[PDB]
């Protein structure tokens, strides 16, 4: 029963106790309950406001408050990179660890814009974890938009606590402090973290006012704080590293907030999805949830799309995804329902993708009518600037030796003599 | 038939004659075929290229060759704009005047954002003609959109001859020079006249890079030009007055030319209609065939919004228009077919208009059915409404306020809507 | 007189020794016990690029001054022309008979909106005979003067500044200032400016340099006058003339700096870009200044010249183009004759080519120019410029009814032949 | 005999049977005469209009039938960076080698804003080739911007064949696949690979809505395919590396195509040359014919820029080109006309050039009159981004040693008591 404010973007205020927060200032002399005030600056002051998110904290200690850090010895990000290779990629899902491994300890890094150690655009993880967090950690390097596939989490972050599960997202801010646990023993799913613009809903062109994901759906946790009293770990990843101090004091310990740099969660199935209702394949940005913008207009540092239950009315109409090339680069992963949920493919820049024979000839034999794609979800991470996979991800026992095989059987149908 | 050029804002090149076009270059000074260069600029010369639309012309006479324009003693759009007046209207069908009246007589003023002396915004008309056109005209005041709703045009431009029936759209520039012929005999149809920044596709958003308006579609004539020797009028339409002039030639004796102010026609059958494929009913934007754009980014002088054949899927949704309050002005028409948030009272070639702010939205019945509706996949078929939506408020003539067609009790549509509401029972 | 130099620059200029308060634009002990004044002549928001604002240090507070009253002579009074879509033409005007100043001369030629409803450009031509006994502002648009005939001494509360011919000058909204005739009488061109200031254009390709440079754009240095006794202070708002009477002279400021500054500049200084090749680049090439609007490339309007220039472009029909624009067209001419137009078109004169009226040469420009043998050509001797607004330019009904007005201009192309042959290329 | 449609940025239309394009929609069920639908994206889907470069594509066989790509043991881009040098720099042209090497293998790299492996901003390349292409290409890290010298180039596309000669340009969009022929046993000419975005028309300023390249000179070719059978290798560039697969078809296969994405050519002689008509010497940004801009207004990742035959006629004016330091990087070529045609100049951020002692002693003499400059035809690839010299340009014999030399010999001829 966690209550949660509505609204993607809104000037939020929630405090844990009656008048924690000031009325009518940010920095009283004397704070309510003696608290401190803390300011988060997720971004550059100068921002529009249209951009601008930052919240006030009103907290029992200072996060100044804390010893030198130190780099930890175990580094699950300091992998290298992976030789070049412009080939289509595919792998199946990745099995958990046996090894005790946290929700920050189980990143597995798939693909990413630039090396962990000069974060840019866009990294892509699969996390695996069989243990629940015992200390708190903070992203220098990006927001975080986590995509479970696996596992129910229970998130408790500075601004309160939220849960997902498979088929709803979440995001983190970069610096936000926050601690994972694992309600179902083990977890996993996908990560999209975002070094950029951070991510907001798409410009809704000629939809409008309203439609895919409607601004009432996104949720905030309402506040809460710890007051736990002994040593407590805190892990920060800075430049891909991890390093840690010790505390003594629960870093969760915000009493009252307000703004606008919040977590939030989002649940794919109240997308409301806009389609063809007449004929043809529409352009995959249609199903765009959210989206990280660069300073080129129109083109995304990255645009997170999904691909739900919808019904299909495309009349003479080849109806899968049409065959294409882009100067984009698309990572698709599975939620649920050769791709299995939890699998993945990478498909980068001007390489040739579409569907195999077998899509195909059923396509092009059916009888045309309304039907409804159910029980299935999956989406996509596509970005501007070129994935690279990892080392780990191109040795991996995971990565399919013959996915080109897939397009093998594709047919020519010419006849220059039939129209 | 007629060829057609394809490709919505191209640099397009035509020739009647074989190498009629300078290549290399616009102004040679011995010209192909002795004809003479012309620009006609539809933009300012320092508009961005996206919004540059400007034609070399090579034509057998200069426009400038021409005597003074005196005023017409008929003038059909010399009518007072009506009295302060916010409710709802409806009007039926606007019958085709007895007299003698071709196309650019048989202009009736609907509604108009400004006094026709002053052109502003958008200003629309529905015109009715029963005569084919024996002159020349151009229109100073704006860019013509024309949405025929009975009979077909044949319609003779200085780019070329274009014909138009219903369920297609045209488009002609401002300033350009044509000649309507009536196919059927007689021809009725709908004109937003845009004062403002030229129509163009909309903006996708995130419907990408294809869908709605395909540029594909819109079509521009070939290059053709007359010789006729003898006297022809040309008429202009400026600050909403009529203005002729004698001619001893033809004006449109353009054999070749190249640029992107062109006419242009549409068939809004091919229009690739984009709604929901889940639940909820898709904001009316959704639907933009055309957009003139004003300086305030999202805020259209007009949008040109079509309601055509369509599946309607939504789940656990009231189908129909939801009710609405708005601060655009929404202007509707009927090509053919029925509309589906009304019942009686909107035919082919009826109008409506629901102003800044006033209250709209489907009517008992509708409301009754759509709730109790057993819903399935449903095709929309056989129909094809639409919108003329402005920002600026649409002031209806005197002659609109005053017609047979202005229907009396438009209010009573509404009159029957019933509470549902019951407090103890979510 | 001397000038400073640099256009759009902060400027700061003072008559007396330290006048200018340092560090500061709000002292409590003003320098000489001048009284510091703002003037605004942009909304405060607006980017620094488009900000214009100067700060006076004055003798007096323009606050100082008793109600104004409603002039009986009211020289912009006249009523709007009616509707016509005509190609016009006008001669030179001639000077008036009856006493009259610089701003009871204008002769309202065509405006985009009624006197009293000031928007986008109001043309006038100014006719006068007299120096100003009084001091002037207008509060309903920036002044652009294109002088003709005579020389201009034009003081301002930022100083003194001459004008003649071949030159043109700015005057901002709202900035008080005093015409004296160095030659006796005068006549000219007006493009008053309701809308946003002019400026320099974007050069594009042209790149940093060019056309009109910035550094040949002069500002007065400070003047000041001290003279004890009535002045007549008149205002122009919303088309009408009001008036007060001061004890002391307007022009008392002694100190100044910032943005917002009278001008001049010399025409014949123009760094004239053309074509090195063939065809007939866009007039708008020739641009000096331009007042932009919201809609970015539709400028209010531009103000353009035809100065002396070389004439290289091979195989090309050299003339003007055979023309209709959206934009509005009124050109005038300062000395010299105009390469597009035979005759009929004189120092003084001026045309308007409104909305899709069809223009171009006419059959004697066409005949010479399509026979011509083609090699590199000085034009030269002459000056003249356009007006191009985007709002459509209505005639008011003076210039309709003026004796100055063509009847016959529609015949400079009544004998264009027909040269085409369907048969030879 | 080759046909061409013309108008730049147009979308265009063509088929090589009568109605091999779908009427009304992109994606039929049953596609006229069999073929497949493919679109290739050339940019991101949410491109603002005026910026969408998009192609569809209707072929006998999918991009995506293809097996593994592999590496080619043969690779001509992967010599190291040179390294720091800030001289003014001067290179003789280029000797086509003697062993046998076709287009995409004779690319010898000369500057670039970056790495090879890390494509960012502008490739600058000389091309020398001896042999035909008997395989197809495309680049994945950018757009082609060719720039003949010497020997005609028969280019074969997807969209269909061009043929360019030295004085004309061609373009060739990312991703696209392409075969060059060489129409005179050998080739050499400059290369710009541009991986920002994609060159356009410059904004004409006061130069209005005519002038410089006027769009109707811009040519793309029609719809042309082929049905040869057979083994072919399909190359691409990605990351600067040479892959290569086998199919046992043409990949030339597009029966019709229709959209924005095309290649193209354009004949500089064409160029509506604009400058000064009366004193001074204006910015060579006036003779842009193409450029490829950044996010940010006015500076561009490139100009490219020519300086053709034309008028001469400032009065009281130095003619030749001003002494200049830039912002920007000049990268000098020469097509026809110590300078030679196929030689090249590399003046990079704020290094001093201008006239030498002899051109400015003649310039300042000089009786002053109209003068037409004719039968040369240089040009330049200005970047906003820095040009590192490749190793390979650094050290090979072409390179002029004694360059800075030219300049040794400009006096001083300052005499201030005289005016
Ligand atoms: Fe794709
Ligand atoms: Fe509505
Ligand atoms: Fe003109
Ligand atoms: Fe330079």
């Given at each position: 029963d966690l209550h949660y404010l509505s609204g993607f973007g809104n000037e939020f205020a929630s405090e844990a106790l009656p008048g924690a927060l000031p009325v009518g200032q940010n920095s009283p002399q004397k704070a309510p309950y003696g608290l401190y005030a803390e300011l988060l600056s997720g971004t550059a002051f100068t921002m529009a406001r249209s951009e601008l998110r930052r919240t006030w904290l009103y907290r029992i200690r200072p996060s100044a408050l804390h010893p030198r850090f130190e780099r930890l010895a175990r580094q699950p990000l300091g992998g290298p990179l992976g030789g070049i290779n412009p080939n289509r990629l595919r792998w199946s899902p990745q099995p958990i660890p046996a090894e005790p491994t946290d929700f920050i300890e189980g990143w597995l890094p798939m693909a990413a814009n630039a090396g962990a150690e000069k974060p840019a655009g866009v990294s892509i993880y699969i996390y695996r974890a069989n243990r629940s967090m015992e200390r708190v950690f903070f992203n220098a390097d990006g927001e975080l938009l986590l995509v479970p596939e696996q596992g129910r989490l229970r998130i408790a972050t500075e601004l309160g606590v939220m849960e997902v599960e498979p088929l709803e997202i979440a995001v983190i801010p970069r610096g936000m402090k926050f601690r994972v646990?694992?309600?179902?023993?083990?977890?996993?799913?996908?990560?999209?973290?975002?070094?950029?613009?951070?991510?907001?809903?798409?410009?809704?062109?000629?939809?409008?006012?309203?439609?895919?994901?409607?601004?009432?759906?996104?949720?905030?946790?309402?506040?809460?704080?710890?007051?736990?009293?002994?040593?407590?770990?805190?892990?920060?990843?800075?430049?891909?590293?991890?390093?840690?101090?010790?505390?003594?004091?629960?870093?969760?310990?915000?009493?009252?907030?307000?703004?606008?740099?919040?977590?939030?969660?989002?649940?794919?199935?109240?997308?409301?999805?806009?389609?063809?209702?007449?004929?043809?394949?529409?352009?995959?940005?249609?199903?765009?949830?959210?989206?990280?913008?660069?300073?080129?207009?129109?083109?995304?540092?990255?645009?997170?799309?999904?691909?739900?239950?919808?019904?299909?009315?495309?009349?003479?109409?080849?109806?899968?995804?049409?065959?294409?090339?882009?100067?984009?680069?698309?990572?698709?992963?599975?939620?649920?329902?050769?791709?299995?949920?939890?699998?993945?493919?990478?498909?980068?820049?001007?390489?040739?993708?579409?569907?195999?024979?077998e899509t195909c000839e059923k396509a092009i034999a059916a009888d045309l009518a309304p039907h409804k794609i159910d029980n299935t979800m999956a989406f996509m991470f596509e970005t501007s600037q070129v994935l690279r996979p990892s080392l780990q991800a191109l040795e991996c026992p995971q990565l399919q030796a013959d996915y080109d095989s897939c397009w093998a059987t594709l047919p020519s149908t010419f006849n220059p003599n039939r129209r």
């Open positions: 646990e694992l309600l179902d023993g083990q977890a996993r799913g996908y990560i999209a973290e975002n070094h950029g613009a951070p991510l907001r809903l798409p410009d809704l062109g000629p939809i409008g006012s309203n439609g895919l994901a409607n601004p009432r759906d996104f949720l905030t946790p309402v506040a809460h704080y710890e007051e736990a009293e002994g040593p407590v770990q805190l892990v920060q990843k800075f430049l891909g590293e991890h390093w840690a101090c010790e505390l003594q004091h629960s870093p969760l310990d915000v009493v009252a907030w307000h703004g606008s740099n919040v977590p939030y969660k989002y649940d794919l199935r109240r997308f409301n999805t806009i389609g063809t209702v007449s004929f043809d394949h529409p352009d995959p940005s249609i199903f765009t949830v959210l989206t990280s913008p660069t300073s080129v207009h129109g083109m995304a540092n990255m645009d997170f799309v999904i691909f739900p239950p919808r019904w299909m009315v495309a009349e003479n109409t080849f109806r899968p995804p049409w065959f294409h090339r882009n100067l984009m680069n698309e990572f698709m992963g599975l939620i649920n329902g050769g791709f299995l949920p939890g699998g993945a493919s990478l498909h980068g820049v001007m390489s040739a993708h579409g569907p195999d024979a």
